[PDB]
Assembly symmetry: none
């Protein structure tokens, strides 16, 4: 809400909980984290697979671009000579 | 359940609160990092499509260039 004013309120709020409610609330917060982690791992693997594909595709585009370039200047020279 | 009876409760309440805060704080860095991971890997997906087309298009040009190189080859 306000960045520090909120932490103040929010920490009082945990202060006015019992230890056992805090342990309850917290055990849920872990649930949520190991769920997020898992998705992190899924997301990192999919990003790594896609940048490999971009990698491969980029090379072939280079491999081919340079082929075309050469050809193109061969076709100019061998054309004008006519 | 109770692997935690012991973990969280050797701790003082004040330690727990500390522990709960920092855990909130990293759930939150991680939602940001996961967001970035979702967006990035959808951009990279756009990318691949853009590259699959530039490739196709480059192949059409390669075929033309080659067929022309071949015409000239035959006129020699």
């Amino acid at each position: 809400d306000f960045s520090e004013t909120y932490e103040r309120y929010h920490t009082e709020s945990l202060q006015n909980m019992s230890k056992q409610e805090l342990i309850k609330e917290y055990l849920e917060l872990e649930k949520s984290l190991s769920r997020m982690e898992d998705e992190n791992n899924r997301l990192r693997l999919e990003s790594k697979r896609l940048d490999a594909r971009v990698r491969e595709l980029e090379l072939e585009l280079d491999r081919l671009r340079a082929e075309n370039l050469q050809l193109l200047t061969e076709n100019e020279l061998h054309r004008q000579q006519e």
